[PDB]
Amino acid sequence: YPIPANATNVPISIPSRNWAAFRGWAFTRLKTKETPSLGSGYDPYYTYSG
Amino acid sequence: TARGIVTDFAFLSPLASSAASRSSARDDKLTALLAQLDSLTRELNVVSQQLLDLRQQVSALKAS
């Protein structure tokens, strides 16, 4: 879930499922310019190949 | 122009589902501003009369 403009506080979304067994939890953060929407090959707004 | 207009709408795609939880997250946070920025402003105007009396504590006694 993205972080638009000057941003700090964001909650989680998905509720309805069965929570069987986990191993751990991990966070991470990446730019929307750096990484495109997955499942296409080429996107117009992806102009950062680094 | 061909690329410039397109970028803004599409990138909010995973955020689309959490529309209800944020419109109401906002309102109560603004109610939190009502008290947190009242108490804070009240501390500034009081300094108004404290420094005004501190003025006349020094200015009247430095003189003698």
UniProtKB/Swiss-Prot annotation, chain A:
Induction: Expressed in the late phase of the viral replicative cycle. It is found in: Virion; Host nucleus. Transmembrane segments: none annotated. It comes from the Viruses. All late proteins expressed from the major late promoter are produced by alternative splicing and alternative polyadenylation of the same gene giving rise to non-overlapping ORFs. A leader sequence is present in the N-terminus of all these mRNAs and is recognized by the viral shutoff protein to provide expression although conventional translation via ribosome scanning from the cap has been shut off in the host cell. Homotrimer. Interacts with the capsid vertex protein; this interaction binds the peripentonal hexons to the neighboring penton base. Interacts with the hexon-linking protein; this interaction tethers the hexons surrounding the penton to those situated in the central plate of the facet. Interacts with the hexon-interlacing protein; this interaction lashes the hexons together. Interacts with host dyneins DYNC1LI1 and DYNC1I2; this interaction might be involved in intracellular microtubule-dependent transport of incoming viral capsid. Major capsid protein that self-associates to form 240 hexon trimers, each in the shape of a hexagon, building most of the pseudo T=25 capsid. Assembled into trimeric units with the help of the chaperone shutoff protein. Transported by pre-protein VI to the nucleus where it associates with other structural proteins to form an empty capsid. Might be involved, through its interaction with host dyneins, in the intracellular microtubule-dependent transport of incoming viral capsid to the nucleus. Belongs to the adenoviridae hexon protein family. This is Hexon protein. It comes from Human adenovirus C serotype 5 (HAdV-5).
From Swiss-Prot, chain B:
It is found in: Virion; Host nucleus. Residues 30-57 form a coiled coil. Induction: Expressed in the intermediate phase of the viral replicative cycle. Homotrimer. Interacts with hexon protein; this interaction tethers the hexons together. Self-interacts with adjacent proteins. Interacts with kinesin light chain KLC1; this interaction leads to capsid disruption at the nuclear pore complex during virus entry into host cell. This protein is only encoded by mastadenoviruses, and may therefore play a role in mammals tropism. Structural component of the virion that acts as a cement protein on the capsid exterior and forms triskelion structures consisting of three molecules that stabilize three hexon trimers at the center of each icosahedral facet and fixes the peripentonal hexons. Dispensable for assembly. During virus entry, recruits the anterograde motor kinesin-1 to the capsid docked at the nuclear pore complex thereby subjecting the docked capsid to a pulling force. Three N-terminal domains of hexon-interlacing protein form triskelions between hexon capsomers. Belongs to the adenoviridae hexon-interlacing protein family. This is Hexon-interlacing protein. It comes from Human adenovirus C serotype 5 (HAdV-5). The gene is IX.
